[PDB]
């Protein structure tokens, strides 16, 4: 497929170790500001969509508003304690709800919360 | 004597009958600059003159565009 000017639009990747150390220093600087805090946020267990990937789960975007309520975690406090919220996703089944509520109670057991000021 | 002295670029390329410089186009507000000749651009880019003001900007940014005096200066 060398029909166009391939020479003027060729990208080389000699900075692949250079981008790697820059990426690690970004994670390093993120935990410098958020020192006791983790570097990421809680994501729910989500089932992959198509019939090819029905039998494998993955990490989704955020928790359902019903999933926060069943676990006893308030919705306007959840982003402040490191839990991602997604209002677009719905449960549609008790198995998706029960798996993610159990995940939120496990996060609740492992959590150390500090009192304001 | 088709061309005369140009005020802006200083070359003897100002057409006498048309009053338009063939190198920069003096009556036009924009300096003439075409992309089909890279060589003519390196003859007139920033850096080919004396840098009476642009050369002192980098030192002021190094210190955060500081204003004032040193403490206890006379």
């Amino acid at each position: 497929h060398f029909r166009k000017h391939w020479q003027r639009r060729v990208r080389c990747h000699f900075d692949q170790p250079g981008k790697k150390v820059t990426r690690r220093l970004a994670r390093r600087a993120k935990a410098a500001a958020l020192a006791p805090r983790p570097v990421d946020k809680l994501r729910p267990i989500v089932r992959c969509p198509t019939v090819k990937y029905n039998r494998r789960t993955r990490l989704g975007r955020g928790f359902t508003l019903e999933e926060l309520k069943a676990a006893g975690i308030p919705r306007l406090l959840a982003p402040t304690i490191g839990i991602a919220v997604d209002h677009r996703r719905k449960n549609l089944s008790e198995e998706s709800l029960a798996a993610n509520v159990q995940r939120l109670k496990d996060y609740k057991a492992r959590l150390i919360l500090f009192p304001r000021k | 004597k088709t061309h005369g002295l140009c005020r802006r670029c200083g070359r003897r390329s100002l057409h006498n009958q048309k009053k338009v410089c063939a190198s920069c186009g003096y009556p036009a507000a924009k300096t003439r600059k075409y992309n089909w000749s890279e060589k003519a651009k390196r003859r007139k880019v920033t850096g080919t003159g004396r840098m009476r003001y642009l050369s002192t900007v980098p030192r002021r940014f190094k210190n955060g565009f500081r204003t004032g005096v040193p403490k206890g200066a006379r």
Partner: protein, 121 residues
Amino acid sequence: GKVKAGQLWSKNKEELTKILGELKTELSQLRIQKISSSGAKLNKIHDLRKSIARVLTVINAKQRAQLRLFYKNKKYLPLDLRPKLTRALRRRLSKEDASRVLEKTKKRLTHFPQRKYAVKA
């Protein structure tokens, strides 16, 4: 020949104007008699030129400081007294303007702020 800048900051404006008076006049008579036998007069002429430049800098410095003391309460400063920065730094939003937020977003951030926490292993 050379006037140190140390004593110039002490004296007032009217006494500086006399030194500025004698400095160019001594320079002018020197320059007339320098065109013949330009030897150590030429070193002295250079000392005169630096001394003239030094008192002019000191005269100017106390002038705008007095102007800046006048304009310490008024809103609009003159153009020459304003700081330079860059063009874009001057048209940039002010620190109070860029930082202020809506009331509905202040009420949210007051009662639900970013808490600090840790997760056990």
